[PDB]
Symmetry: D2
Subunit: 124 residues, 4 copies
């Protein structure tokens, strides 16, 4: 059968119905290309436009980081959950990185599954 | 035998050793005084300056709202959990309100407990 | 003005509509009266009978512990979030304690707010 | 680069150093082979034996369900977070399923990443 990782939707592997839903469920990551080690910087993650109702909303977003050279990966960075109708899926985190790697954002829609975006960040 | 509600630290209630910790644990809420119904606005919540390590950090922040004329209260708005060492306890949410009320922020430090801050918001 | 801890419903201090909603929202805790320090035991926490739909369900349960002699309190033990329609608000945790104290259970219903129950635990 | 789904450890795909960590990080799912639609039943999920310290513990477990015939998948069932040193990674949920599918448990160790187990459940 399918492993969990095969189930996560990405825009470049979108198939069938999923294709039409990619633009409004794939997280958008706004982050600098380059940061200094140990220095705080902001990352904004937003999803949509998308409905926001009890029956249908982006429920949460999780952020992970693949850190270069780590014996195991990834490192979870944060998780934010949004109450339907009150909080929009658009959030700004403050992060400190130590080493270059890859930032992953995963959002969940209760109807339309798990969607992944990723962005490389260089740490100098 | 205290109720759970009595355990929550308010800087306006700080007795004992709680006094000294209050500045570095009490959430700061930045939000407008007045917003328009159903119009998205941003709320920044930050705690610090505070240690950020596995043994000691702000683990999470929860946002609640007391909505005026709501038969039961409060309403949870959202929740963010931070990874020790990687995410700083400084987050911006995007919210939508329909009725005036009081915005509550609760931060948790694994060593130092629950800290409440509040702000009134008016909805036009 | 109202502080956050004042908003939490106790069957203790339930009045008004909060009286009639109390039986179906207040957490029921099954735990031993006495446990050996650092020895794992089980705590079952359940809420109901209660609706379980997108529009209306028990969204989560948080477990806190007031540890006797800790300079700050409480300590969160765990948190469980339930998906509407699929997971019932009935959960068993495995805990281990080092000192006697008071166990707190907090459930959240999206329409009916926060509900507290508590149980003293002795540790030998 | 690497997609997030490719990062999740499974015992059959364990490469190198991760092979030796598999027994103590892969979730163990105890669940019935067969249930009736809409009828509650228990699923126990545990991980280990594993250390449980601030510096190193199973931080959380998430449960998802691949539901047969659903246009998108999977459905998140629930999530449980454990406070290090206090809650062991051994939890029992109560679930109601509506249609046959595959149950997934994902646990996270702060040092050793994300691990997956899966179990097929028939719903009649
Ligand atoms: Fe959707
Ligand atoms: Fe602290
Ligand atoms: Fe209710
Ligand atoms: Fe480990």
């Amino acid at each position: 059968m399918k492993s969990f990782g095969e189930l996560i939707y990405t825009p470049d592997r979108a198939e069938g119905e999923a294709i039409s839903k990619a633009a409004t469920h794939t997280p958008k990551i706004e982050a600098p290309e380059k940061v200094k080690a140990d220095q705080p910087f902001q990352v904004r993650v937003s999803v949509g436009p998308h409905p926001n109702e009890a029956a249908h909303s982006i429920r949460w977003i999780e952020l992970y980081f693949y850190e270069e050279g780590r014996p195991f990966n990834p490192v979870m960075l944060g998780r934010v959950a949004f109450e339907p109708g009150y909080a929009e899926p658009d959030v700004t985190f403050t992060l400190k990185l130590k080493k270059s790697g890859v930032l992953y954002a995963i959002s969940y829609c209760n109807l339309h599954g798990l969607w992944e975006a990723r962005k490389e960040i260089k740490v100098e």
